[PDB]
């Protein structure tokens, strides 16, 4: 906690609002402050790499501006097509590209099929197969929670009476233990 | 019924290992033909240095001819005349020569395989300032120049980190590189976070079979003895009836 | 009969899901394969075009190696105008201003010699250069410095190991990633659901004997002797 | 482990507002500390994308293709006879990107120097470093201003033409083809020219799902943790008032019970 109360307190300059959400831990926190603290921490490490992130980027998008203007002179070069540029480099290269321009053609001169197929596909097909299998598990975990879920209630309906019935099982029993001395002189 | 039941199993239980199984083993060679044509391409590449820079050479060569053609031109008449305070500075233009001479003959020896060791920045001339990009190529380079740090050194202090990362580069081989140098180290956070999660369970699981491995053995042994003993006491409570 | 059904066309539905994997799969592999494949050709194409480069430069270097001995030579020629001079109209001067926009264009040389220069001592500092980059680089260390967080201790005290990191926190890159990697792969499923059927015995054998066999004995042989010394009671 | 069920219920209480109150600070307050640069940046990104890789899905047929009159070269030598007559129709379709090869020695030189910084004049805060640093890198370039009119000499007969062979056919299945192999996926029919312009939607729906998809995934195997763990309470639970009840009631109650009745059954013995 003593870790919280020193990061909290720079947070703590901006968390102005968040009093409202502060207040009402502290008076639960007790069970759950080493919790909070374990997402202090890796939460306080997403800032200084979303801090780093936006420094990557900022400058990785200023230079694909520089090299992606060096490049444009592929047009150009052919500057005889400026007429008929937009019907046909500028349609092709677009309605393809475009979405995946983002993330996935920066490497088309290397990558290009490579990537838009088997790669992509190498994350799709990684994914959805392995989740679907860890899902025949998984959906049988849904049987082994309903079943056990199921076992819990059936269990507790025999329990329902047990649980209730040491109390009168205690009581019917022990009577006999307070005679017993006056049953061991009939032996005789 | 039970057998025809059974077939309708039969048919599922004997493709459902055709389809994972060819086609995991069509992932693990299309892998390798992704980065099998990387290093190669990338041989077009480094060799496209070579075409791009000597033709520039080839260029100069014309260049330098443009240079020397009338310069070699105007000289020989003004010579041609003679030969058939200002000398000062003519003679200190001599001293010019002499050191011309050895930069002339530099003029191809450039071309030493030194410089075709600095090509590596020189021929994407914007890629070899280092008071504009000594931070850029670490940055937006060394996703691209990653596999050339194998041989050339000094790229490798980001090629062997992610080298090392290469489960990282096999799932994003050419441009999914370039995001999870960002995603990445949140990742292994998120692992980090979900084997927590173990942690969180485990936490108090552990002491779960830690507790039931020996509380749950002693019910299990003293009621084994206990019933092996009450046993042979239930039959004589009749006993003590049959003849009564 | 409803439940085998739903089990096994449940697990062929994994396989017609299965199955529209590997049609997903072969149709690309030709195009990822034939790419490429043009590529393999490429490189014997490229294995003319690299002696056909090599046949390239040698036939210029070896001209501007014959001219350049020539433009010596008419300054070494001009010596002579000099030594010319030195043994005794105007547009000589001129000529002599010439030559002086040529050491202008000279020097194009030095400009490049000083970038020369700048390999000859970017490739001297070898495996030290990681620790002069990272001071321009320090961006890549801010990575592991995040990953420093996966060591409390480590945390503030990883900022000045930066310079070492590229050599020697790679084993932290590498440790971390790789076991976080591999704890992944075969330890945070396989642990964990292996640890769980662990508790499911724990169930198990409780069920199988604490109360099933328990219950199953007690209150059979019990109720016998209770009826049978209460009917002499009677 | 009525007590231990109780614990994540008091913890669930703050935990609560954790999720409906404080996820903000961690996904929406954090744009106050950095995450609006990044997102500005990652929105800047997708109109750097408009921008760049427009010339990178052509470029990457220019040296590409252009490698066919390398070849052609050593072999147009004892190919001689045709190599001139053989350039203008053929460079039509496999030697058009020549020019770039013809004219790198100078647009290689001169992209860094004049293109590089001008998609827009707005970059014309930063000629200034480009420039400076130019000027003298690129000296010994600069002499060749002549080499590139000699090269512009004969290829003006191949600067009217290409428009029409090599441009107008490499790329009308450049994007086709590239395109197929996601919608024959499950529209095969329509993939040829059909789903080809909707494919930035059905390819962003992979794209989308590398980023959105994973993220669910997480969440997806994260509460597969929690299905374990809620999935371990019950269990826990179960066997947990299995455990206490052989010894709180059968060992003890249980067999306390009948084998003091036997002395009882048993008494006149």
């Known amino acids: 906690d003593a870790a919280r109360i020193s990061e909290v307190k720079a947070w703590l300059t901006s968390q102005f609002e968040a009093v409202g959400k502060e207040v009402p831990n502290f008076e639960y926190t007790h069970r759950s402050i080493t919790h909070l603290y374990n997402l202090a921490t890796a939460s306080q490490a997403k800032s200084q790499a979303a801090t780093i992130v936006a420094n990557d980027f900022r400058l990785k998008a200023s230079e694909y501006r520089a090299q992606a203007a060096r490049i444009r002179e592929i047009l150009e070069s052919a500057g005889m097509s400026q007429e008929?540029?937009?019907?046909?480099?500028?349609?092709?290269?677009?309605?393809?590209?475009?979405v995946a321009n983002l993330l996935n053609i920066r490497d088309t001169e290397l990558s290009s099929f490579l990537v838009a197929m088997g790669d992509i596909s190498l994350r799709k097909t990684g994914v959805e197969e392995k989740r679907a299998k860890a899902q025949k598990e998984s959906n049988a975990l849904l049987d082994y929670t309903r079943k056990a879920i199921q076992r819990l209630t059936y269990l507790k309906k025999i329990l329902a009476q047990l649980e209730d019935d040491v109390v009168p099982c205690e009581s019917?029993?022990?009577?006999?233990?307070?005679?017993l001395e006056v049953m061991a002189v009939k032996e005789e | 019924?039970?057998?025809?039941?059974?077939?309708?199993?039969?048919?599922?239980?004997?493709?459902?290992?055709?389809?994972?199984?060819?086609?995991?083993?069509?992932?693990?060679?299309?892998?390798?033909?992704?980065?099998?044509?990387?290093?190669?391409?990338?041989?077009?590449?480094?060799?496209?240095?070579?075409?791009?820079?000597?033709?520039?050479?080839?260029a100069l060569l014309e260049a330098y001819d443009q240079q020397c053609d009338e310069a070699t031109r105007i000289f020989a008449e003004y010579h041609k005349r003679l030969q058939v305070i200002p000398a000062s500075e003519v003679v200190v233009d001599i001293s010019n020569s002499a050191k011309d001479f050895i930069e002339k003959e530099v003029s191809?020896?450039?071309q030493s395989p030194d410089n075709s060791l600095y090509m590596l920045p020189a021929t994407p001339q914007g890629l070899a300032r280092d008071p504009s990009a000594?931070?850029?190529?670490?940055?937006?380079?060394?996703?691209?120049?990653?596999?050339?740090?194998?041989?050339?050194?000094?790229?490798?202090?980001?090629?062997?980190?992610?080298?090392?990362?290469?489960?990282?580069?096999?799932?994003?081989?050419?441009?999914?590189?370039?995001?999870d140098l960002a995603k990445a180290i949140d990742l292994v956070h998120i692992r980090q976070d979900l084997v927590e999660s173990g942690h969180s369970l485990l936490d108090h699981a552990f002491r779960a079979q830690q507790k039931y491995e020996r509380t749950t053995n002693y019910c299990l042994d003293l009621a084994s003895e206990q019933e092996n003993t009450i046993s042979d006491q239930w039959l004589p409570e009749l006993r003590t009836a049959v003849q009564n | 009969i409803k439940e085998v059904r739903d089990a096994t066309l449940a697990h062929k539905a994994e396989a017609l899901e299965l199955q529209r994997q590997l049609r997903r799969l072969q149709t690309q592999y030709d195009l990822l394969t034939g790419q490429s494949s043009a590529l393999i050709q490429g490189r014997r194409a490229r294995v003319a075009a690299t002696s056909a480069v090599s046949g390239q430069i040698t036939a210029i270097e070896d001209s501007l190696s014959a001219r350049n001995l020539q433009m010596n030579g008419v300054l070494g020629r001009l010596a002579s105008t000099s030594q010319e001079l030195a043994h005794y109209m105007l547009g000589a001067f001129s000529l002599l201003k010439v030559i002086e926009s040529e050491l202008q264009g000279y020097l194009?040389?030095?400009?490049?010699r000083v970038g020369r220069c700048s390999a000859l001592i970017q490739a001297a500092s070898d495996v030290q250069e990681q620790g002069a980059v990272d001071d321009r680089d320090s961006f890549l260390h801010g990575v592991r410095d995040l990953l420093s967080i996966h060591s409390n201790t480590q945390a503030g005290l990883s900022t000045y190991v930066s310079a070492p990191a590229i050599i020697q926190q790679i084993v932290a890159l590498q440790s971390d990633l790789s076991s976080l990697q591999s704890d992944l792969e075969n330890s945070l499923p396989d642990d964990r659901n292996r640890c769980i059927n662990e508790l499911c015995t724990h169930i198990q054998n409780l069920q199988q004997l604490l109360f099933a066999s328990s219950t199953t004995a007690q209150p059979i042989l019990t109720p016998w002797p209770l009826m049978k010394e209460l009917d002499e009671m009677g | 482990q009525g007590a231990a069920q109780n614990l994540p219920a008091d913890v669930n209480q703050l935990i609560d507002q954790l999720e409906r109150h404080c996820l903000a600070p961690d996904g929406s307050l954090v744009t106050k500390s950095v995450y609006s640069d990044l997102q500005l940046a990652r929105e800047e990104m997708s109109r750097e994308r408009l921008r760049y890789l427009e010339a990178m899905a052509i470029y990457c047929e220019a040296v590409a293709m252009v490698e066919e009159y390398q070849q052609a070269i050593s072999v147009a030598n004892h190919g001689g006879i045709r190599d001139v007559q053989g350039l203008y129709p053929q460079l039509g379709l496999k030697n058009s990107p020549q020019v770039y090869e013809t004219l790198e020695h100078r647009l290689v030189v001169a992209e860094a120097a004049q293109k590089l910084r001008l998609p827009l004049i707005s970059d014309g805060g930063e000629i200034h470093e480009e420039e400076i640093e130019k000027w003298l890198g690129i000296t010994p370039a600069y002499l060749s201003y002549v080499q590139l009119q000699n090269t512009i000499s004969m290829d003006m007969a191949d600067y009217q033409m290409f428009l029409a062979r090599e441009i107008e056919g490499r790329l009308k299945e450049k994007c086709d083809k590239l395109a197929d192999a996601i919608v024959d996926d499950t529209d095969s029919s329509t993939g040829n020219r059909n789903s080809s312009a909707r494919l930035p939607e059905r390819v962003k729906f992979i794209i989308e799902e590398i980023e959105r998809d994973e993220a669910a995934l997480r969440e997806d195997l994260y509460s597969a943790d929690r299905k374990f763990a809620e999935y371990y309470n019950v269990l826990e639970q179960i066997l947990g008032v299995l455990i206490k009840l052989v010894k709180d009631l059968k060992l003890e109650h249980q067999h306390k019970y009948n084998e003091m009745q036997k002395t009882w059954l048993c008494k006149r013995c």
């Not at chain 2, 077939?7 to 994972?20: C, N, P, T």
């Not at chain 2, 980065?35 to 070579?50: F, I, Q, T, W, Y």
């Not at chain 2, 790229?155 to 090392?164: C, G, K, N, Q, T």
């Open chain 1, 84 to 98: 008929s540029l937009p019907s046909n480099v500028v349609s092709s290269a677009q309605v393809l590209a475009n």
């Open chain 1, 172 to 179: 019917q029993m022990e009577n006999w233990k307070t005679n």
């Open chain 2, 1 to 58: 019924d039970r057998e025809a039941a059974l077939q309708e199993r039969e048919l599922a239980a004997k493709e459902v290992e055709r389809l994972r199984n060819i086609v995991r083993r069509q992932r693990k060679d299309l892998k390798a033909r992704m980065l099998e044509v990387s290093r190669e391409e990338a041989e077009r590449k480094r060799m496209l240095d070579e075409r791009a820079n000597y033709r520039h050479k080839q």
């Open chain 2, 108 to 110: 191809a020896f450039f």
């Open chain 2, 134 to 179: 000594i931070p850029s190529i670490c940055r937006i380079s060394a996703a691209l120049q990653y596999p050339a740090g194998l041989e050339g050194s000094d790229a490798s202090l980001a090629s062997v980190l992610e080298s090392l990362e290469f489960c990282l580069r096999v799932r994003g081989s050419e441009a999914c590189v370039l995001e």
């Open chain 3, 108 to 112: 194009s040389a030095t400009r490049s």
